[PDB]
Amino acid sequence: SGFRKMAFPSGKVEGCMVQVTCGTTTLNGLWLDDVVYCPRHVICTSEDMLNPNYEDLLIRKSNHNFLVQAGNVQLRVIGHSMQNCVLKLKVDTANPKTPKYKFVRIQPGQTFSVLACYNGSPSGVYQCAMRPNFTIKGSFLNGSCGSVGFNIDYDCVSFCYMHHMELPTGVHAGTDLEGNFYGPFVDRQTAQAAGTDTTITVNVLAWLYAAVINGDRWFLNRFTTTLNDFNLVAMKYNYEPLTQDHVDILGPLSAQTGIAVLDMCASLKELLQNGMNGRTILGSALLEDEFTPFDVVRQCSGVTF
Amino acid sequence: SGFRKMAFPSGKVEGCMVQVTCGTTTLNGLWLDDVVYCPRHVICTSEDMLNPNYEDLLIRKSNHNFLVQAGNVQLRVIGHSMQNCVLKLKVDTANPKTPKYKFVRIQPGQTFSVLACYNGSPSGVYQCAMRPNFTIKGSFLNGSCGSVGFNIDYDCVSFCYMHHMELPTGVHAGTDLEGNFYGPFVDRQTAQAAGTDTTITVNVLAWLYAAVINGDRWFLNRFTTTLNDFNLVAMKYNYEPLTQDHVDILGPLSAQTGIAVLDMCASLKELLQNGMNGRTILGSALLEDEFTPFDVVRQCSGVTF
Ligand SMILES: O=C1CCN(Cc2cc(Cl)cs2)C(=O)N1Cc1ccc[nH]c1=O
Ligand SMILES: O=C1CCN(Cc2cc(Cl)cs2)C(=O)N1Cc1ccc[nH]c1=O
Description:
binds ligand A1BTM; 3 domains; SARS-CoV-2 Main Protease; main proteinase (3clpro) structure, domain 3; six-stranded mixed β-sheet; alpha+beta; Thrombin, subunit H; hydrolase/hydrolase inhibitor; SARS-CoV-2 MPro; homodimer
């Protein structure tokens, strides 16, 4: 019993973090097989960051301009390339600790664990979500660039996120492991519009199911609703529209609690139109949307890796 | 910027988790050097759990009754003893992955990371606090017994918690690594009084400092107060009394934000007597007491391990 923001165990990722140094800049890299992946703005001085010509700047750099440290084992770089917004350093040594892994582009609303890192050394781990507007609300200080987000299925690490940027608004932006930014962002020191966010409806409902599994049942009502009627409520409260796909994803939680999906939408409706009255659900006084239905099932059933 | 419940990276602990099997029971153990530590109720059948005679039950067990699995490496048990509420299995093999480590008894209000585990395999990691009443509010399912809580300073793992028990109230109880329960609890299937909890005042204030560091400044008032006057407010709202020790611990955050401790107590006072008005502080609509001042300094300054 109980429900926490739980991250994946990070050991498999810890053995892949290295320090990457080019000119005056240092940030984190990810060392898998004989390749290190890091944000391409490692090649920039602070002057370059207003409008960098990455091609032109990369041309001035050779293999020996890149220092990769893995603890103390200084790796030797024997090849370099830019793929979108990441740099790929070919090193003479495959990582003895390389896990089975996949590069993935996650979808808005999916969650992952972040291993926040500084000078190639892990600092802490926490869970969060790709927002509908393709930002993440993280905890990242200067030097955390190249920290990665990930999921773990059994023994397989799916890397989905590399940190590039704090927006002047205090939220975070970054790329998949191919170097393509999530969202409209670019790797320049400029103000950049995130655009309107929404709340991840299917995740709130899954959290409502988690609450019922743990004995928090007070928001369970006697009303029901329809998908379209609820979607009327969702649009007004800046919630994502709920589709039959979402209803199917929630089927297993529906069945384990015996509360139909549309019935639990009827409770969410009341919570939206009437608030919480200063009560709490699973210890929070707000509706939480950073648990996917899988996150809930994994925690209330106990899946290991 | 940003502030999250952040756990320590768990890799050092992951390499120590093993499965421990005695009779019909299986739970997690912690393998350091040539000794495995696990809850002593591994030797109990479900009948025994109402009022077990642990001495008498342990007498019926020999070295070969204990199966320790570390992945697949079945370790061989060559010695066994009970220390308080833990069992210590002497195994023929020192753990190649033993980290530098200490056993510690933490104090109420201190925090630690839990690596929740099932059948000796890690499931997820999260942060929490030893409550004033010596329970923890965790996420633990059946089979999570023997999961451990810990802190990490540089390269040193301080183990502070081993999970034994979910109370019929849905909260969690357990021992230090010497086998002594935190709190009044015992390892029997009986209803057990946790006793009145309180809120950890010095932790709320540290979180208030974290909020000011991240730009959430709206609760900053123009009033001040005195330690005794504030303590009047604390006692009424079931907050722990604030002492000069706590004020000294907060000195570094006071200095970095330039807000005197007693001034920030004056804001906490207003928040307690008047609530939040449906606004939020660092994304929460409640006062958060599971960040120590060190937790805050480590996150808003970026300490690594
Ligand atoms: O480390 C750095 C260095 C430079 N820089 C600025 C730009 C990077 C990109 Cl690409 C375009 S502009 C940045 O954003 N970070 C991340 C970061 C900084 C402060 C608090 N939290 C953070 O995550
Ligand atoms: O795994 C077990 C097995 C038996 N058992 C009952 C007693 C143990 C002690 Cl000592 C005295 S009575 C227990 O409490 N757990 C932990 C647990 C169970 C269900 C949800 N969450 C949990 O943590």
